């Protein structure tokens, strides 16, 4: 899916 | 000395539930009572000892019917253990997805929202914040009983702001604007996540902003885009959902107001029902 990430 | 301290020997591990970027969790047995419990573990894993021990210290200070209850700890010598009550139906996200919608009807969804707001209101007073308010972190017990996972609580005088390290990851689709742009958090950031949680509930576990790539979420929020009212979702609930996504923190209601709102809808919904 894709849930966690570092802000852009 | 500490009344929460339990010798490692009192618990036996039964089955592993799921791993975690913060420590695998197990289903275990507290022999003395023949009680099924949940065991939170951590090896030279993800978290670092001191942080883990502080979470444990914080968990000993909370008590609310809608917050998973701490039962004991093993913090003296490795491996470290955090023991909590066991929620038989797992997390809310998976529950909503595989449930019987005739049983998990409209009044049950309102009831569930009321239990969560209740926990958050309380967390707002005792000067706490939940790092990740989302359906995946809500557990379910018998009779539609919902509780918020307590392992994600932190200390923060209600009203103040926290600034996370640089380069850190956040669950994008549940994160408030102030956190995406400046890595800032507050009980108001939790209010924003609550709004998204209300949406997961109204859609029975659908993923937020369907088809919208993580990289495009912030730009959309900026230009004033917001998820549309779900099919079947009562208008009043959608208004709260919308009040929770106000771009400006101090414009979002408090959990004290939100719990009052749901309390009202759940009772007046139990009346027209039994009538
Ligand atoms: N974004 C994130 O939430 C990071 S944590 P994660 O590793 O990505 O996922 P998660 O599995 O949710 O983490 P955790 O170890 O917190 O949960 C593991 C699984 O076990 C079940 N669980 C957790 N506490 C439980 C209690 N008290 N009783 C029964 N089952 C419990 C969760 O449903 C989860 O799948």
Author numbering:
A (entry chain C): 104 to 111
B (entry chain A): 232 to 506
Authors' account:
BCR–Abl is a constitutively activated form of the nonreceptor tyrosine kinase c-Abl. The improper activation of the Abl tyrosine kinase results in chronic myeloid leukemia (CML). The recognition of an inactive conformation of Abl, in which a catalytically important Asp-Phe-Gly (DFG) motif is flipped by approximately 180° with respect to the active conformation, underlies the specificity of the cancer drug imatinib, which is used to treat CML. Our results suggest that interconversion between distinctly different inactive conformations is a characteristic feature of the Abl kinase domain.
The other crystal form of the H396P mutant has two molecules in the asymmetric unit that are in different conformations. The first of these molecules (molecule D) is in an inactive conformation with a flipped DFG motif (DFG-Asp Out/αC-Glu In) despite the presence of the ATP analog in the nucleotide-binding site. Previously, DFG-Asp Out conformations of Abl have only been seen in the presence of high-affinity kinase inhibitors such as imatinib and PD166326. The appearance of the DFG-Asp Out conformation in the presence of a nucleotide analog shows that this conformation is an accessible state of the kinase domain of Abl and is not induced only by the binding of high-affinity kinase inhibitors. The second molecule (molecule E) in this crystal form is in an intermediate conformation, with helix αC partially swung out of the active site and with disruption of the conserved ion pair between Glu 286 and Lys 271 (DFG-Asp Out/αC-Glu Out). Molecules E and G were obtained from the same crystal form of Abl and are very similar, except for the presence of either the ATP-peptide analog (molecule E) or the kinase inhibitor PD166326 (molecule G). In these structures, the kinase adopts a conformation intermediate between αC-Glu In and αC-Glu Out: while helix αC is not rotated out of the active site of the kinase, a rotation of the side chain of Glu 286 has occurred, resulting in the breakage of the Glu 286–Lys 271 salt bridge. The conformation of Abl represented by molecules E and G suggests a mechanism by which Abl can interconvert between αC-Glu In and αC-Glu Out conformations.
